Amino acid sequence: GSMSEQSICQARAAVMVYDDANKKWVPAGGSTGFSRVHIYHHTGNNTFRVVGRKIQDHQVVINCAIPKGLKYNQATQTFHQWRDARQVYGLNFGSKEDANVFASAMMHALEVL
Ligand SMILES: CC(=O)N[C@@H](Cc1ccccc1Cl)C(=O)N1CCC[C@]12C=C[C@@H]1CC[C@@H](C(=O)N3CCC[C@@H]4C=C[C@H]5CC[C@@H](C(=O)O)N5C(=O)[C@H]43)N1C2=O
């Protein structure tokens, strides 16, 4: 938390999860809109996670570990995505600057893990 984790970036993005059964992206957490998406570094054990909160109502729409070896796909300059055993996640960034901020922090996490 506040004492164990440190934010290494903030970026604006609509967070989406892939509905594998329907072959469609769905808003993470149930409602379409932009979130503030952090990567948080647990400095103690050198782990990272992605945490995003809807700007409007503060709902946490994503909270997922970044595992070592993750393949992070920059599909376009403003839409990046990744997978784990359970979900495919997509970040539709509000600008290329946000995309670069977040990708730059994710790529750091992946090299230091
Ligand atoms: C082997 C594998 O798993 N491959 C993954 C990718 C991957 C590769 C390597 C490592 C991890 C991963 Cl994750 C894969 O390809 N995946 C993950 C499931 C989703 C998808 C599969 C098919 C569709 C084709 C279309 C494409 C897609 O979704 N978009 C294209 C460009 C961005 C464009 C942007 C936004 C969203 C807003 C909704 C819709 C729209 O804009 O209307 N849309 C889009 O159309 C978006 N797909 C994918 O990304």
Side-chain angles (χ1 to χ4, degrees):
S2 51
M3 289 183 59
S4 71
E5 295 179 274
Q6 171 174 310
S7 179
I8 66 173
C9 73
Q10 295 181 307
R12 189 66 61 89
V15 189
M16 319 170 173
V17 288
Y18 192 71
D19 186 347
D20 353 71
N22 212 232
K23 273 72 176 177
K24 297 292 164 189
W25 290 98
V26 170
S31 76
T32 297
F34 283 87
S35 293
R36 178 167 288 105
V37 190
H38 297 251
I39 299 176
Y40 282 112
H41 181 202
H42 191 290
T43 53
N45 42 52
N46 190 34
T47 55
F48 297 76
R49 64 170 174 165
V50 176
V51 184
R53 289 182 169 271
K54 192 67 63 64
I55 300 291
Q56 187 199 357
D57 65 347
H58 313 295
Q59 183 197 10
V60 175
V61 297
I62 182 169
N63 175 24
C64 60
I66 304 175
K68 178 177 175 51
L70 180 71
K71 193 175 297 168
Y72 180 73
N73 184 237
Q74 304 185 35
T76 70
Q77 286 182 279
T78 61
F79 186 84
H80 307 170
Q81 45 180 342
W82 66 96
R83 311 171 305 211
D84 58 40
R86 314 176 184 76
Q87 287 270 50
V88 188
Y89 308 91
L91 296 176
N92 199 50
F93 295 99
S95 70
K96 301 174 180 165
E97 293 72 7
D98 287 290
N100 293 342
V101 166
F102 187 93
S104 293
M106 174 62 75
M107 293 184 61
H108 172 71
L110 293 172
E111 188 84 48
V112 175
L113 273 168

